[PDB]
Amino acid sequence: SSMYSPNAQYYGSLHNTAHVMLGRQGDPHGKFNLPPGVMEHFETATRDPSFFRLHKYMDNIFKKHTDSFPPYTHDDLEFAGMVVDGVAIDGELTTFFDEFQYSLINAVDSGESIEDVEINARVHRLNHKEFTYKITVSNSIGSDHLATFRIFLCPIEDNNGITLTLDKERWLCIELDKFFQKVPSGTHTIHRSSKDSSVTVPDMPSFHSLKEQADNAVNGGSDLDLSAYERSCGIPERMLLPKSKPEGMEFNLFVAVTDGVKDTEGHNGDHDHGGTHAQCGVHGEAYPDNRPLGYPLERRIPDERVFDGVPNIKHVVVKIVHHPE
């Protein structure tokens, strides 16, 4: 729970206490002088497999609430006069592992009056090749209109080879992008690069790089456009796509185009929302999208006919291939 809780005396702090409960299971009675578990730091918690069992448990609590609302109707979902004619991607969807280095110098003891030496860790990390979405829309209103583009990747089959219904897919879908763009009258193709995702941020610049850039500016006088780096909150760009398999896997790419005027009311459409607003919001500003998080996949969809009848929603099959070493 957070300090926004209306009643912590009654509702307690389920999630934060659970982190400690799990983290301490190696020494639950303090007999062994063991330090806190990996679950007791946000730096480390996702290293523990139990992180995801705990958070699925918590996720299902939220899901009982979100499932309690009536399914969306045609009128709920329709962006009148906006149809998605096609969805395609420029570039193959390819994942691989590459190598990344970071410095261990801060971990080791130095001094006094003894020189340092370069000490690095090299890790293998998931990555993917660049691609660009091609989303063809037709705006059959006689005016340009702001639209929200909501992009999700959804499984088609489970690990047993069983084809999933839309209701069984929706809670498994992962957010790939969300952006606001003016759609002029007529039929037009919207292009969106994978690198520009509002879900992701680039790899952090190294400490050594930050020192070099700051030192070069201070010792001299140079206004470096530091307004370049994203934020550190956001799924790493390299992890935008799931690993998939060497033999390839097919997924549903789900695109919902919604009324940007209504979605952004109170926060403007032309305004800059930063590079990570989908899950990390906008630093020092209100959250720019009024819709429920997960829209339009966050309510039950018992009747797939409802979604199929909405011209501003479309999904297509895409293939992701893993390229092993």
Give the residues lining the site for other proteins (CB under 8 A): 160-162
* Distance of alpha carbon 287 from alpha carbon 289, whole angstroms: 6
- Output DSSP code: residue 245: B
Q: Which of residues 161 and 324 has its CB atom nearest to other proteins in the complex?
A: 161
Q: Which of residues 169 and 175 has its CB atom nearest to other proteins in the complex?
A: 169
- Return the closest-CA partner of residue 157 out of 55, 244, 91, 51: 244
Q: Which of residues 33 and 160 has its CB atom nearest to other proteins in the complex?
A: 160
Question: In the complex, what is the shortest distance from the CB of residue 158 to other proteins, in angstroms, rounded to a whole number?
Answer: 9
Q: Which of residues 108 and 162 has its CB atom nearest to other proteins in the complex?
A: 162
Question: In the complex, what is the shortest distance from the CB of residue 94 to other proteins, in angstroms, rounded to a whole number?
Answer: 23
Question: In the complex, what is the shortest distance from the CB of residue 160 to other proteins, in angstroms, rounded to a whole number?
Answer: 5
Question: In the complex, what is the shortest distance from the CB of residue 159 to other proteins, in angstroms, rounded to a whole number?
Answer: 9
Question: In the complex, what is the shortest distance from the CB of residue 300 to other proteins, in angstroms, rounded to a whole number?
Answer: 22
Strand partners for 208: none
- Return the closest-CA partner of residue 165 out of 306, 68, 318: 306
Q: Which of residues 158 and 308 has its CB atom nearest to other proteins in the complex?
A: 158
Question: What b-and-e string marks burial along 56-74, b requiring 16 or more CB atoms within 10 Å of the CB?
Answer: eeeeeeeeeeeeeeeebee
- Return the closest-CA partner of residue 158 out of 251, 229, 266, 261: 251
